Symmetry: D2
């Protein structure tokens, strides 16, 4: 038994929607009314204390048009025989399971009209297929569906928890403790969680993320969120960055903290309320992009990636290099991992001429894959020429020549990135940040704003 | 007129306390009862709708011992004559201002005993000095103190706002918008703010931070928080880091993101609930430490600093270097900025021998200031020998020799810090993180835990 | 269709009780808890909004012993075919009416145990006989019993009203208007009424009076109250006297207002709180007793009758007399109406000798029916010798000789009854009222007190 | 000290009213809003918990016109020195009692305007005369008027009780017990009582009755109600009749129960809702009228008196008679008690000729005081010719000739009044009751209806 999907046709803010499910579902978003009414739809399906009051006039979509409320839940009941819950649901049914090789089982809610006696009359049915459903046999005030499930609702037998906004009047470390108790522990096998706090998602795994969109009409995006085997050692700082990234609409994926220093200076000199409108700067370091990108893509969040063209030397060999910054974007568009590039380099002068011939080989590599770079730029993936300091030299290079007394300011900024980045931020004006922001190689910051 | 201090002697959780004030006071902490009763003490001093009900038996410290409730507020009323509020308070008083060259004015609340008629009888007095106070003359239900001030209390004439927990059922960007409206705008000249969210302090300036301690007895620490003129370009990312650091008890100050990757791997292999007990990793990059350290020191938060011995070359000259990592700790202990150190370096071999002779000069500089290093280590300031990769080589250097096929793993890790740090984290065990954590040059992580 | 009886076995204050019913039932008494729980038992039988909440632990008689709640209602459904409600109940049933010549139909409530899941599970059944009942077929939240009846509950489809205490914050004439609207008008065919006010029963006819007794255990007495054809001209002053008599426990039935003056003087000189303990003086004038006596007997109220031996002359004949005061008590014990007694009286002296020979003939009639008088006295019926002034002469006759200056005070008191009764009350002492109250011919006043 | 009057000028339903007071004040009527706002005016004068909230906009008479609320209470403080409350009020005042021979002391409430700050600011003053009042000196939240009095408000130090509607959900004998505890016992020296039940006034003495009239404008009538020394033996049945008479508007004062039988038959054959509109039949027997008439006159209730011309023989003498029915109406208009009338009567025929010559002497007495009878009829006092049976003979005498087979039906009805009155009621039609009601000697029943 594993919760597959719930079909909410007619309810307070729903028309013909499907939400895919698994166990441990998490709903979040900016529409508070849809996050309330999703848990109210689950309480009308599976709790006696909400279903015994019936339907009012307020819980209809249009009050005279499409007057048939249906909630259908999908269970997928064929599983291995050592599971207790599969036997506990198949023992209660008698003729609702018709053929023993069937796989899918439905719990179908139906309602009648409201125009006479001002009442809903919720009617619940069982069966293995959608046509020829059979009524659930009850005798008094207790249905036979109520002898299977149990619902506990938390606000500040197969057991389904419903936790609504647990961060209210709560400290930060208690929210991280509640996140660790929710996902790592096996106390809560089935829940549905609504939250506004990113500290309640610092340890999340094997879960559905449900994002409710910011529109007035309810749009639901669902993702089967997992952390893979190679990502398990950098897992919780990835979850700490991504849990703050889940409450945004437009997210820029950067690498360094000095990039955050420079871009945040350019942002509060140009667009000083980017954090109010839904912008977020996400630091991604030392990993590939596609675990972030599949999560934000299936949750409907626009992902913008700014990256540099890096050359990585491998272990045990000298003079052979890997095309790392190409291969991350090739993994993002689903293509295969590229081959080895070897460069024959002498001893030469090691301080600057080796860096200059590596920059010239990166310039030739950026030249001969120009249509692939445009393909990446076609989306929100932006690959730099050599680095971002050399893209910064093409915009404010006279300013970098007049702040520092050195002749070459790019090498002086690359000698110590953080302290000379703070010295570049401190002697900077408004027109320099507009020269950075208006440039064609820093277009992605405009894609962070979008207005 | 400027709010100096409030003396709460007898109230629900107070004995003889003083809290220093300014305008725009912010109270935070883990004692919710003291943060409620501070605003209740201000409502009993300055609001009619709480003062007209009197005192019960529950708002006494001991119910039979020390039965004299006093709230005394300090105003410091001498100011320039173009201020409207100084004239609006000095026009109402007639004989309470005795001598015209006086500076300090008091608003003194007093209460009587509770053992007969079960009532408090709050009595309010004026005067320029603490002895020979005069009664405030009123006529009916309205006091003459009520013709000066006005109190608006917000829960989800000189005007004093009182905002209690505004982040409840609220989105993140609305909390950042409320922070920008609270501190940058001049709509709220006087307030007292209680919060649990770090996003309500992302733009804070010219304010009192009040930290209520985690003990059962109420301890109040207050700091006159300001951002100086040289720190104004890196101001709001400093406030974003420090606002999450204000809700912790033990804070480690680090520099890089790769240090956060390595230390966070060592932390969830050794002490996996450090974030639950009050630990926090704070990234400080490119700035001096003392603006963080004066704020956390006057708020009573233990600050732990891990830093490396850096040599910084200056602009316009070659072969002369600055002792930057010494001078940050010398600024932390209040000593003067050190002189210039020049090193005569030939052309040599630029790739490794220049780095080796710079490491040997840093080793000699760490040798000849050994008593200063112990002095720093005497507190929570920890200065590394060359870097933290060389301190990591002394603990897990056989592991770094067996992961990478290179002969020297320190130079390979310093070639690309982030990606080889993720490769060092991925091939790492429990005993390697215990070898890092048990070492004498990584003692500060134990100071992050303290248990 | 006509409501016959309700059998409440297990409920909050009931063990195996039966209450006989008709349409327009009225419940009254001093047990407020039983008058609340009777209407709660009807709401649990016939209202959806009480039956959907189920049973708690508090609505059981003993919480572990006799755990089977049964409410059975009797309908007697065979009637003439022009009644709409008989066809509206027989159209809904299909197989619950088995044989077409059956007369009695039952609505049977049943409940299960409470020791597991803390719930009652009310189960409702139909059928023509008590064994082999069939379940009421429903489909959702709406039963098929709910498609017949409708319950409106009033507190300050076949339609059943439930009015609980309508005299609260209400004027007296509005209570008399509500009584006239309740019983004379045909707006309320079916109701159940609880009241504390006697002005809500000033016009009552064709109704059940239900008296709940003053004990802690619930005792229900029911009477089919009607006013007959010969009593219809003196009907509403009889209802005004009897409606105040229904809220008492011990009621003395007297005739004159001068008897009320004398007995009320004797009562506040002997037992000054007789009205507090449940005593009531009821004036019955010009009628027979048995309409009062059948109502108070079937409602369980002890009726005490004090009466005089009267001789009534008939119309159109002279010298023949009727034994009226004997025949009222003979009608009370169910015996036949006695014959005519003729007395041959000359012209004589008309003022006193005719009254003396009529008193001697009444003394001979009281002599020769002595065993019948004892039979009446055996109950609470007390027949005087001649009048009550002559019984008053045997107790306080020296006091009546010393107040009035006339030789014969009985004839002077019978000349003007009211004004000389006020003159006898005004010159009276405590020992004279104890001489009246301790006498053997005024024992019935002691039967008014009983303690 | 004795409460004299309260002057409520501006309040919710008051303009310039005076209500005279004593101790033990009782307010009753049909305006529930005025009975609520009288106790709210006393709570605003004398209770801290209502006065500390101030005045809203709703408790003004006109919201912009006559914006000065004044409540002035009169105390009359000069009394004998053994009274404790006089010394307890004169000890608290210091200069408010100016001259020691003064008698009257005032408690003056004043209020300010409401158009700025939305507040009332109740100001209380003391002094011996109405001009040159002095402020009551207080120090904090407690006034010095609050150190004298104490107010307890009951809803289902000098101590003032306020009991509002205590008959709600209460039995009848508990209301009579509460009446006996209120007036006979000295537990409640000062109260103000509002009620709707006549059983809470069955033992009332030494009290103010306040009747609030049925109009929308508040009219207050007050009477100093007492029972005199000669009326003390018939006191509580007089209070039982008069307490039901206090809740009516038009009251007919009759004598016998047979008059109630006949008039109540004529009333439900002509005006069947006389009890709904405010009519009441009051039985007065054996007493004079003026104790009822002074109470109903000072309470503003229209009193209608129907009486017969009676001749009363005195004690110890024969042949001399008293003009009783004249002298009750002469006491009602305040004239002196008339002399003795002697009639020389022989032995004659005692049965009918003595009654005929007494009726002829009553006819001559009704002839020679014709202008006095018209004077009585000028008001609502109606004196019959001989009796009311002889006035009934002039209207329905052919009906009385056709019901009874006797030749003279007046003597047959006067032989037994009650049983032949029930026989006259039983054989009666609608046109006979219209012949009674339309007659000029039964005009007072029309004065009972008035429409
Ligand atoms: N002044 C310079 N002129 C030319 N090349 C330089 C200069 N400084 C540094 N480089 C280049 O930078 C490379 C790396 O620098 P190096 O290993 O000497 O460390 P560093 O930055 O001088 O040391 P530290 O970080 O301790 O200040 C050198 O191999 C050399 O090619
Ligand atoms: N294989 C090596 N052997 C010895 N020294 C090396 C080696 N690789 C790098 N270095 C040292 O590191 C210094 C800085 O490296 P360099 O400027 O050549 O960039 P890089 O790390 O090779 O380039 P990129 O970042 O594009 O991969 C050199 O001046 C040299 O002293
Ligand atoms: N003084 C008396 N002595 C003897 N018998 C009397 C006396 N007074 C009245 N009676 C008797 O009472 C009977 C009825 O009284 P009657 O008809 O004379 O009226 P009343 O009571 O005198 O009149 P009223 O009611 O007008 O005062 C008489 O027939 C007579 O037998
Ligand atoms: N049939 C009659 N004819 C004439 N006068 C009568 C008649 N009956 C009664 N009376 C008058 O009524 C007066 C009072 O009546 P009386 O004393 O005889 O009592 P009663 O009414 O006959 O007795 P009881 O009340 O026991 O029936 C008599 O004195 C007489 O004058």
């Amino acid at each position: 038994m594993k919760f597959s999907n719930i079909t909410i046709k007619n309810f307070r803010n729903f028309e013909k929607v499907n939400i895919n499910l698994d166990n441990k579902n998490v709903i979040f978003g900016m529409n508070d009314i849809g996050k309330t009414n999703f848990l109210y739809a689950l309480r009308f399906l599976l709790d006696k204390e909400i279903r015994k009051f019936g339907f009012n006039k307020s819980d209809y979509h249009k009050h005279d048009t499409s007057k048939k409320i249906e909630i259908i839940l999908t269970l997928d009941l064929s599983n291995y025989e050592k599971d207790e819950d599969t036997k506990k649901l198949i023992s209660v049914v008698k003729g609702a399971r018709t053929s023993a090789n069937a796989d899918v089982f439905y719990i179908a809610l139906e309602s009648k009209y409201d125009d006479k006696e001002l009442y809903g009359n919720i009617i619940l049915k069982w069966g293995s297929e959608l046509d020829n459903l059979i009524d659930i046999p009850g005798r008094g005030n207790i249905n036979a569906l109520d002898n299977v499930f149990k619902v506990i609702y938390i606000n500040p037998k197969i057991v389904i928890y419903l936790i609504e906004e647990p961060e209210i009047s709560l400290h930060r470390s208690m929210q991280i403790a509640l996140s660790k108790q929710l996902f790592e522990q096996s106390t809560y096998k089935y829940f549905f969680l609504s939250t506004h706090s990113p500290e309640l998602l610092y340890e999340m795994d094997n879960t559905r993320l449900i994002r409710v969109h910011s529109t007035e009409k309810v749009v639901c995006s669902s993702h089967m969120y997992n952390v893979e085997e190679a990502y398990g050692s950098v897992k919780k700082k990835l979850n700490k960055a991504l849990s703050s990234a889940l409450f945004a609409e437009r997210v820029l994926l950067i690498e360094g903290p000095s990039e955050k220093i420079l871009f945040e200076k350019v942002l509060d000199e140009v667009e000083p309320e980017y954090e109010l409108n839904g912008g977020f700067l996400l630091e991604v370091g030392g990993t590939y992009f596609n675990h972030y990108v599949c999560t934000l893509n299936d949750l409907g969040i626009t992902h913008i990636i700014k990256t540099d063209n890096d050359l990585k030397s491998k272990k045990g060999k000298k003079g052979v290099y890997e095309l790392l910054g190409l291969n991350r974007c090739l993994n993002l568009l689903g293509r295969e991992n590229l081959d080895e590039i070897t460069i024959d380099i002498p001893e030469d002068i090691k301080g600057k001429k080796k860096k200059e011939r590596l920059n010239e080989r990166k310039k030739e590599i950026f030249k001969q894959y120009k249509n692939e770079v445009g393909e990446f730029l076609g989306e929100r993936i932006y690959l730099s020429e050599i680095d971002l300091e050399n893209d910064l030299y093409s915009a404010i290079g006279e300013s970098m020549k007049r702040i520092f007394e050195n002749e070459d300011p790019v090498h002086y900024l690359q000698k110590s990135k953080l302290f000379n980045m703070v010295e570049l931020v401190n002697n900077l004006s408004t027109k320099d940040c507009f020269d950075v922001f208006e440039h064609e190689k820093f277009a992605c910051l405009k894609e962070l704003v979008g207005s």
